[PDB]
Amino acid sequence: MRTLLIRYILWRNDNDQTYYNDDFKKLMLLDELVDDGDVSTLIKNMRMTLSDGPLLDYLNQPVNNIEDAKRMIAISAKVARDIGERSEIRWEESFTILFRMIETYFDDLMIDLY
Amino acid sequence: MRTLLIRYILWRNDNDQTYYNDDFKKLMLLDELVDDGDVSTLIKNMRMTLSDGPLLDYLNQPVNNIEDAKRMIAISAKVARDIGERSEIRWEESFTILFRMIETYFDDLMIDLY
């Protein structure tokens, strides 16, 4: 799940067809769980501060169930998409927090998606 | 370079043909810079300790030139290959250190390889 999510989020950022996989189809379905307004806000703040700061703050919120975990994946993916490839983001810092919060749900998320 | 190296190292770990790209061909050439004995030792220690600890210790060594930077990429790649996909490694912790050391050489590494 760690490798899959890294690959997915990075592909959402750059849109390189050579790095696409059908495994992503099921993960892209998680987008319905997230309100486009929350993403829009997060992007505005990231641009206002010229940093990944607002994203790292979003990812630090508690994850109490599988639905919270799915929303975190979706928010990261939608943010990656909407921020653009030119954005100088140390993605590994975001993955560190994301996986710290969602790690436990990996087994169940895999079952849920596939 | 950050995205490319993440993608390369993860592909070296699982050998998933669906996640392969021809950009990796030039990076795989860096393997000649690394002695297989150093990798063998690193793997032995990682298994002895049941941790990525030895790898994170290797990556914390100073990088004084582009050749040091290339050796770090090659050691990470050969370790990723030899440790196996089943290995529960928090890859983002390794990428954090690797990129902290090699970040500056990215522009020059890109020129050197492509």
Numbering used by the authors:
A (entry chain E), B (entry chain B): 1 to 114
Reproduce passages from the article:
By analogy with VACV proteins A52 and B14, which have the surface groove filled by bulky amino acid residues and do not inhibit apoptosis, we introduced the bulky residue tyrosine at positions R58, Q61 and R71 in an attempt to ‘fill’ the N1 groove and thereby exclude BH3-peptide binding. To determine if the point mutations introduced in N1 generated unanticipated structural changes, R58Y, Q61Y and R71Y N1 were expressed in bacteria, purified to homogeneity and their structures determined at 3.0–3.1 Å resolution. All three mutants crystallized in the same space group as wild-type N1 and the overall structures of all three closely resembled the wild-type protein (0.21–0.39 Å r.m.s. deviation over 108 Cα atoms). For both the R58Y and Q61Y mutants, the tyrosine residue protruded into the groove in a manner likely to reduce BH3 peptide binding. While WT N1 and the groove-filling mutants (R58Y, Q61Y, R71Y) were all dimeric, the I6E mutant was almost exclusively monomeric. Introduction of the groove-filling mutations R58Y and Q61Y abolished the ability of N1 to prevent apoptosis, while mutants R71Y and I6E inhibited STS-induced apoptosis as strongly as WT N1. Investigation of N1 mutant R58Y binding to Bid and Bad was unsuccessful because this mutant bound strongly to all proteins examined, including both pro-apoptotic and anti-apoptotic Bcl-2 proteins and tubulin, for unknown reasons (data not shown). Expression of WT N1 decreased NF-κB activation significantly, as did expression of the groove mutants. However, infection with vN1.R58Y or vN1.R71Y induced lesions that were indistinguishable from vN1.WT. Considering that R58Y N1 was no longer anti-apoptotic and I6E N1 no longer displayed anti-NF-κB activity, our results indicate that suppression of the N1 anti-apoptotic activity does not significantly attenuate VACV virulence whilst suppression of NF-κB activation does.
VACV protein N1 is an intracellular virulence factor that is expressed early during infection and modulates innate immunity by at least two strategies: preventing apoptosis and inhibiting NF-κB activation. N1 is a Bcl-2-like protein that contains a surface groove similar to those in cellular anti-apoptotic Bcl-2 proteins that bind the BH3 motif of pro-apoptotic Bcl-2 members. The VACV Bcl-2-like proteins N1, B14 and A52 all form dimers via a common surface comprising alpha helices 1 and 6 (the ‘1–6 face’). Biochemical and structural analysis of these mutants demonstrates that the anti-apoptotic activity of N1 relies on a hydrophobic groove on the surface of the protein and that the anti-NF-κB activity requires an intact dimer interface.
